[PDB]
Amino acid sequence: NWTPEAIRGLVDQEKGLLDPRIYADQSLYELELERVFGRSWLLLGHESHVPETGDFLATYMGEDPVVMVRQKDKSIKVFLNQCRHRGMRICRSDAGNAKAFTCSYHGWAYDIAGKLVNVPFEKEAFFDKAEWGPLQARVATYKGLVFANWDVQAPDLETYLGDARPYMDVMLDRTPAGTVAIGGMQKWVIPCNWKFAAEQFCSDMYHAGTTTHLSGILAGIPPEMDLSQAQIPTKGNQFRAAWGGHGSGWYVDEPGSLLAVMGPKVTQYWTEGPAAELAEQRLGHTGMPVRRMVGQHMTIFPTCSFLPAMNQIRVWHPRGPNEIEVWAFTLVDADAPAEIKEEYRRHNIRNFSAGGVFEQDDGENWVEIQKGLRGYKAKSQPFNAQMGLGRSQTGHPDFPGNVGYVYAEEAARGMYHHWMRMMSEPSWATLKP
Amino acid sequence: NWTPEAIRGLVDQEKGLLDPRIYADQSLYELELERVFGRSWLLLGHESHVPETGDFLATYMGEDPVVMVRQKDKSIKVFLNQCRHRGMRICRSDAGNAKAFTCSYHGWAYDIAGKLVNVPFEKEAFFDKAEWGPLQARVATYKGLVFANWDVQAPDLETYLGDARPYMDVMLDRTPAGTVAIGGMQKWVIPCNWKFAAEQFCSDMYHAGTTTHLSGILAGIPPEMDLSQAQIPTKGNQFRAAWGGHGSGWYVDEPGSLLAVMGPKVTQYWTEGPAAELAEQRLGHTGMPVRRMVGQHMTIFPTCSFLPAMNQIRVWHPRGPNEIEVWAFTLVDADAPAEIKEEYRRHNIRNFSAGGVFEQDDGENWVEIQKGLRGYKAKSQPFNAQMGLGRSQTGHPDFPGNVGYVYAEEAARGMYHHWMRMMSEPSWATLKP
Amino acid sequence: NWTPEAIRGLVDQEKGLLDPRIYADQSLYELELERVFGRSWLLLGHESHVPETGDFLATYMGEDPVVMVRQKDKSIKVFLNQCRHRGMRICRSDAGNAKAFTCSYHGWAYDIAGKLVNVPFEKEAFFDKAEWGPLQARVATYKGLVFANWDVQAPDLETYLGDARPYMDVMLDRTPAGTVAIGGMQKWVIPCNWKFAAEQFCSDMYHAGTTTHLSGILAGIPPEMDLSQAQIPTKGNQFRAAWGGHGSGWYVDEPGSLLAVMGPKVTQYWTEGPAAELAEQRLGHTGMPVRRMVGQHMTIFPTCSFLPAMNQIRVWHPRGPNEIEVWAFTLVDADAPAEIKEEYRRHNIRNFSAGGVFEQDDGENWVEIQKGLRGYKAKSQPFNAQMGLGRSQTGHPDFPGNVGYVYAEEAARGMYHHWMRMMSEPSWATLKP
Amino acid sequence: FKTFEWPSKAAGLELQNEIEQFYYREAQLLDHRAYEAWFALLDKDIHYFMPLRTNRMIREGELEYSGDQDLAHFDETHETMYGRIRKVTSDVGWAENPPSRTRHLVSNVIVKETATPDTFEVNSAFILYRNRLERQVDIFAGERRDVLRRADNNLGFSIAKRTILLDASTLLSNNLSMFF
Amino acid sequence: FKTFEWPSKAAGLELQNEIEQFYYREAQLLDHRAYEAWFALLDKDIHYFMPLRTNRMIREGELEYSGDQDLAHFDETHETMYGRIRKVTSDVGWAENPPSRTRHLVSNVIVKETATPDTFEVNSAFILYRNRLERQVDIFAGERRDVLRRADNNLGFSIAKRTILLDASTLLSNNLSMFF
Amino acid sequence: FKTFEWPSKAAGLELQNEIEQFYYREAQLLDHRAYEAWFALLDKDIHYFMPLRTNRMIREGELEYSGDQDLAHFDETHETMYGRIRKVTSDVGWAENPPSRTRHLVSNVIVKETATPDTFEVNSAFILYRNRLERQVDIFAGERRDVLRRADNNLGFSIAKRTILLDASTLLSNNLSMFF
Ligand SMILES: c1ccc2c(c1)oc1ccccc12
Ligand SMILES: c1ccc2c(c1)oc1ccccc12
Ligand SMILES: c1ccc2c(c1)oc1ccccc12
Ligand code: FES
Ligand code: FES
Ligand code: FES
Ligand SMILES: [Fe+2]
């Protein structure tokens, strides 16, 4: 059994060591569903996925299927996609518009709020219907993105995010009109632990600046240019959140990274012109030179990952210690030119879908890591997470928070440290910021 | 760990509540194989499956493969389909006729009684052969149906069935000639827990009277008629066994469901004429008006399920907490007209095979439920089993035993209560009737 | 919990009983990876698989992927195929030649000894590379065969092998030129426990002399001959190693099954002529008449199995309690005539590949045994391992060591006894010979 | 059911092509859920049959398939098929609402002439790939033995008889909510 | 995407064979990793498209497929296909180094003529079996809708447009590192 | 093994059909366990070969397949095949008694002539679906490279050589008790 003492020993942020059992152990996974996914804020999508009354999206919170649905009064409700009678899925399609929901098993009927409004033969058989609707989650929106949490005692979304918000606003708060999601959500299955995926977008620019994506950059650069002529971005920074295990990393003053991925038209839109000036104006309060930030990765713990410059967003749905589902979509500025929106759409497919020239190599790596962890000796020794150890500072002139070098694992150590904290501290009294 | 106290907490028949973990927990499943399947009377088939000396059927008791074989003294023996040498399957085909059985691994030879009669090189290598034959099960027949039980201290079949027998007789004791099985055993795999299937046939007319089988009824009614004209049977009763967790439910006087499922010819045979009148005569000692009972479901705990009017019979073979196999066949009266027998064959295929217009929708529901139970929050709140709570009574002038309304969960509460008892009471001294 | 006391009761060599749970229990399997596979000498291949500097073979020790690589100084190194940074597989092909190894994830570079030589951005982000290379295994060779062991406290290979060595020499030490492996490594998956396969090659000539291989022999005998004319060899002996659970069995004088499997050219090469005479002369001092030995099986505990006269060698890689991978190859005398080498190649393919006329029937048996063990009653009673109980002797006039009849289970009892010891004795202080 | 009795002289290039194209057209109708259009292909005397298949020792091999008087997976007339089409096109037919995604890959087409003009006895092989909801995949393989009549429809033929020999004993799918 | 609207008068035997042989030749190039030779078959105006597929109630069945304004699995031009070929033939393209083992089994070929001479609309079904490394197996099924132009090459045709309709919602594979 | 060298000018409609029909007939024999009839198609000089296939980096891609001096899954003559037929039709041949249920789906047939009259080099793709006992399913994919001779038998051709290129490194099946 996993005692709080034993759980604390799994992660050491001071020495920079990780016990590989965290990615493979079945008992730890089952505790994760309770201690981590059962009380964290999880991304379910965007407001534009459910714009009108009755519009729904069927998604997940961990392994719990949920229904996100817009109400008549313009609010958004999130409830468990499970009938409390005998457990049948209430909402059986991916997305659409509903006037009501009905259980296919015994015909228990619900309104779009998830309230139990009709029980067949109730008079002859029965009990209060208001007590027997499916479990409701707390719902909160941050600039278009819809988050949900089961735990009433968990801190609110804003407090939960903390000083990670400036780096989210780089993507979300560029225009007064806000963002909108491009239609369609890509879904695929990777046989690996969610933490490898979450850590990568939290802290791992290192893999993109080294060997993983040499072929991906080759795919993006002009035919006349070869790999030896490709510019190697080395300048940049990394952010670790004060609380929550959130993290971000970005390049500074070197577009070669973004140029290969998103093309010249997107890079021009991101760095030059009226749109880039307005974005820097709106982000003036943070004091960040957002036009100099070119290519960024970010994770909101545990499983909300995005690439602010490229506008790729994904949720990692856990499927046991050895599997995940990747659900991916893309955002654009609501008032962005139709030509720019097409460039974001086409390049996001080209790079980050299941067949994407970047994604292909990520899954290839994670698949083999997980397979290795079936071995006894492969779990017997700690992984090295000592990169950038004691090199981050809280007083950077350009970027707020605990900031270090772009090639570091300070954000990673913070992610695993917070994981450890969520896994070992049952009461929010000690866990909260 | 699962203490008797903790097991008792999983089911509350007084409040009508069910812990969903019972359908998902791996540790509970392992205990089921010992505490439930290891000492319950389980259906293997019919006497007509093995009519002649040496005729065999290879089947299962839980996850233990067994052979059911007719002996030269006309008795039926049941032994584990496993060689005690190194575990090889003795009988390697589905069904047929055997003069003997021989293990393919090292050639240990067995007679049709499952006695070890020859060991190759016995004089040179060796030990008493009479002690080393495969484990034998207790065998008992109830009106054609063959049941088996491993436990020498368990109650006999008659006591085990108790006051459930009159409701079995409705299908089995209509003629002096008895019943016979139609050739063929349908087999398919459903990814759900065995308890969903067992409970449905035990207590759940509700699903067939509401939403699950609307398209099944639509498939069976005349082409001129549409769903809104199809008669909705609302009159009927439900029986809970005094002991054993057995249960049955039936419609009274409203043949709508039976008519759509089995057609006019079978309905007529079941309700009007000499055969129907002889059945009422033979079932006179029960006092039941059998000709008024139009469409019925039943489960003999744990996994013997049937539909007395339609004559479909099923055994649910457990395959972990998340899977079952369904082995299905049908029975007809031995002296029933050839035209009636053909109608029973046709409509059972049309309705209850893997491609059956009813069966399709059952599996669809169950698959979704089991998938939901992977989630933490989906197992955190009890299921509602409160239907008909406190409404059943033991003095119904037409039907004997604990009888309530057709749409109720009293039989279900009894099934789960007995499941709880088998799981929490290791000794037959307290468990037995 | 599996206490040493509980583990000791799983095997009784005095009574000849085996608890079937050893083949199925998940908890026991996890302890096997630590207590058996984590500290045993395990076969990785032959020296000729990695003949030149930089030549590598990607293989396994239990479920740990390892790299076997030939060094410049002619030594062989074995290290874990896992990067210590975040677990990525270092060597991603089956075999070939390498001048270095590089991680595809973050570009950590290694030399062919498995030493960490380069970390990208080490000066900028960091720690000692000499301490962060993949785990090294002990490597030892016995007459061409390459073994590996993780445990620094384990006895050396020679001591581990003990008096099993002369029986290995029957295959390995026939010529001063030694053996060489025919190119190609056959790999296939069988859903059974590794102990069934290891035991079979350890102690089970019984299965080949009875029923398993009747059709295999039928495939090997002349077209004019059928099974009734085919002679049943019954003369032979069996060896149980003084320590370590090693075992061997062989036919004496009667070459019937050797002739059917390998043909007249190989059979004659083994028994008559200059090559056979040299072997008799080279191995005579160990007190073994190698020319009288016509068809042999052997296991070096836990998972190194081979058939000396047939020259088929294999490793059983465990994949949970219910699955293995079989990795097979064949050896020939380095100075064997071209015609004899070809005959060995053709007949090993014919008999022992996945499509082999012998192998086919082996997997068929094992698949059914493992399926049977899913059942509760199937595991409730001991398996019989009483063959040749108290019949073996250490002063045998013809063969060295503890020797009994060919059809016996003394070597098996020795194999499971040692398994029990490894599983219940945590210190080599007690476990060593 | 033994080896299909193919004629020694193979069917003509035009006839072979016509019947292959019929099956490809039929597969397109089924895979795009044109159930009404597909049902029109079945003649009024249709017998749509999928027997059970069992594990038998070589000596008892003649008992592999279920007979006329035994249970089956399908044993259908025009009347029962009508009801099945009504279910599959229904909003309350849960097993196919949401609908599955299927692929009928057809090959191994052998054409045989009968005693009746314009009527052909056809043997073909198939793999049916069925994808359902989030992550369910069911793969079926087998052969079809048809009696096809020349018809004045969009496909060129009508179906008089269909026997589907599925390569399965125990069905690995939870249901057979698809048409073969 | 509804039933492929096949022509009433079927394509000539020569044409039917020519196009079937083209696909078999194309399958050979891909299954033996002749990516440079395969890329040469793609015209400069190539649109290579694989829309997303979603689970929908029959009443909302029109929303099954992603549009041209939505995300997709593939939505490629000649310029972007060039980059993918450069990645797949690259020594540092880890997803396909070591390469996978694939099989493109092609059947159900239906040929339709267009307004332009020597230009054809072709519908076909496929099963793609992908095996990589030690034990990974990914099976794909679907249909392809191509616009093919006659060309002076080893295969006889060039690809002007290709749409792939895969039988999946959630992809069961970790990637789509193969070409369809 | 490189991309099959198909002839520039494709084989005639008649010859294409004859060879395709031969494979469908061969599939029917194998799928219906007519092993004695299938074995008769094998000429006395038959070489029946299925090499091992390994994972190699692109730079070592010349070493993917095992050679003639290496181990293999199958490497057979007429004498050894005869032994295998005796086993598979034997009552004590446990691996195929009870027998498996197989389906050989054949497509992608490319025909190439040789220097010898009435002798053809043929390339084809296959999926072999094997179902065994209660629940065992083994799916195989790959290509076959045959040398076929015209023969006066029931099928029209005899098999002179067969190489099976299987899309697998490690075999996912416990055995290869079937014929390809
Ligand atoms: C995690 C961390 C960095 C990157 C990532 C995911 O996707 C990228 C695409 C281009 C450049 C860096 C990254
Ligand atoms: C369980 C409970 C009721 C029914 C059942 C199974 O199958 C039916 C078919 C028709 C009507 C009721 C039922
Ligand atoms: C284990 C034990 C004996 C044999 C074996 C494996 O393969 C054989 C092939 C021929 C004869 C005996 C054996
Ligand atoms: S499960 Fe929803 S009504 Fe019974
Ligand atoms: S297993 Fe039955 S004789 Fe050995
Ligand atoms: S895992 Fe090998 S370098 Fe990061
Ligand atoms: Fe990446």
Ligand SMILES: [Fe+2]
């Ligand atoms: Fe039902």
Ligand SMILES: [Fe+2]
């Ligand atoms: Fe054997």
